[PDB]
Structures are given as structure tokens and as C-alpha cells.
Amino acid sequence: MQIFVKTLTGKTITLEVEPSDTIENVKAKIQDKEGIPPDQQRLIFAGKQLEDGRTLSDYNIQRESTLHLVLRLRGG
Amino acid sequence: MQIFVKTLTGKTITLEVEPSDTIENVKAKIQDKEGIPPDQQRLIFAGKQLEDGRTLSDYNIQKESTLHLVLRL
Amino acid sequence: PGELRREYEEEISKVAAERRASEEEENKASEEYIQRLLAEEEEEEKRQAEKRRRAMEEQLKSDEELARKLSIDINN
């Protein structure tokens, strides 16, 4: 299925994922596509920061859902 | 986390630290590397001497920051 | 895609320049303080040196007056 990852600058990535994929697999797919290390990524959907171990189905993330990506680039 | 300590003799020391380490604990790590007793060490960061009781996070000393080591009498 | 990558690389370059500026500002502030501290310690030892300096010259002036008295006495 397709989900979207939107940054606060309005730029949007499209990812093909499975409902059983963990959030860590999602951050890995973002690194494979954008070169952003997972330790710099934070993902938000439906008012929650997403935990790496949980699956997309755990957070009720279905097709065409849009996640918000936040980068930790300062202080770390 | 890693920080650096620059001496007045031109040597830079590398220390593995956590943000909650006290300055005295940092002085202890310098003793492990150089044999300099902690009571003889003055550490300086951002133009000020650091107090033994305070932690690195209290001074907002982040990763790869450079401390300045000046020895006493 | 590419544009999300370009925005990340720009922000990484921006953070790196911000860290070099703080590293330079920190080093400039510390070296100025150290140079001030070393000058104060050098000045303090000079004043201790001059205190011993006039102490010994006072002792020499006292020894000269005694030497003069002894020379007049023993030379018959």
C-alpha cells in the first residue's frame, strides 16, 4: 500500500509499505530513499509520535495516510 | 558522547562522556588519560571556569565541544 | 524526492556552519579568558618577586653599614 511522508516545508515522499511494517522499517525506507539516518527521523500520525517497534496497523495507518516527518538535526 | 579537552601544551584529549557527568567526573577521566590530579585541573569553556558540582548539560556542553585545560600552581 | 534530499543537504550544511561558528566563538572566548588569567598570575608572581627583591636589598644596605663599621674598627 501507499502512504505519504510530509515535511514541515511541504515536501512529500511516497512510500510503498505493508500494514505489518514496523515504524523502524519505515524510517529505513526513508534512509534508503533520502539518505536521512533513522536516528534523525521522527514520525507523527494521528496526534502521536510513532514508536520504532510498533507496526503501521498498530497505529491504524492505512493506504494514502500522510505521516509528518520531523528531523533532529541540532543538539544531537 | 565525545568531547575534547585542549591543553596549553598543544595536545587535545578525547573523552567519552554523558551529558549528566559532573565536571569533577570529567576531571577524573582526564586523570585516567594524563595522570593529572583533579585538584590541579582548571577546566574552561566559553570563557569561564567550570564548577566541579555542575554537569556538562548545565553548561550546555554538547557533543564534540572543546574544553580548555589549565593547570594550577 | 530529489528536492527533499536537497533540502536535507542544505540544512545539514547550514547546521555544520552554525557549529563551526559556535566552536570559533567558544575558542575565542576561552583563549581571551586564559590569556587574562595567565597575565594575572604572572603579575602576582612579579609582585612577590619585587617584595623579595627589596627585602634582600634592605638586607644588603644593612650589611654594608655593618661592613663599614667593621672596617673602621679592625684597621688600626
Percentages of chain A per state (helix, strand, coil), in multiples of 5: 20, 35, 45
Write out the three cell numbers for A19.
500494514
Interchain contact, C34 vs B44, CB within 8 Å? yes
Dist. CA B3–CA B50, nearest whole Å: 15
Max Cα-Cα span within chain C: 112
Asked if A13 and A33 touch (Cβ cutoff 8 Å), the reply is: yes
Coil, strand, or helix at residue A14? strand
Asked if A60 and A46 touch (Cβ cutoff 8 Å), the reply is: yes
Dist. CA C57–CA C73, nearest whole Å: 24
| CA dihedral of residues A26, A32, A33, A38 (deg, nearest 10) | 50
Residues across chain C: 76
DSSP string for C43-67: HHHHHHHHHHHHHHHHHHHHHHHHH
Nearest by CB to residue B45, choosing from C30, C32, C37, is C30
What is the sign of the dihedral through the CA atoms of A63, A64, A66 and A69? Answer: positive
Interchain contact, A7 vs C7, CB within 8 Å? yes
Question: What single-letter amino acid sits at A66?
Answer: T
Q: HSE of C57 in the Cβ direction (CA atoms, 13 Å)? A: 6
Terminus-to-terminus CA distance in chain A, angstroms? 33
Dist. CA B29–CA B67, nearest whole Å: 13
**What is the residue whose three cell numbers read 511494517?**
A21
Nearest CA to C31 out of B70, B11, B29 is that of B70
Dist. CA B57–CA A21, nearest whole Å: 36
Q: Hey, where are the domains in chain C? A: 1-76
Percentages of chain B per state (helix, strand, coil), in multiples of 5: 20, 35, 45
Residues across chain B: 73
Q: Is A70 on the interface with C (CB under 8 A)?
A: no
Nearest by CB to residue C23, choosing from B8, B66, B68, is B66
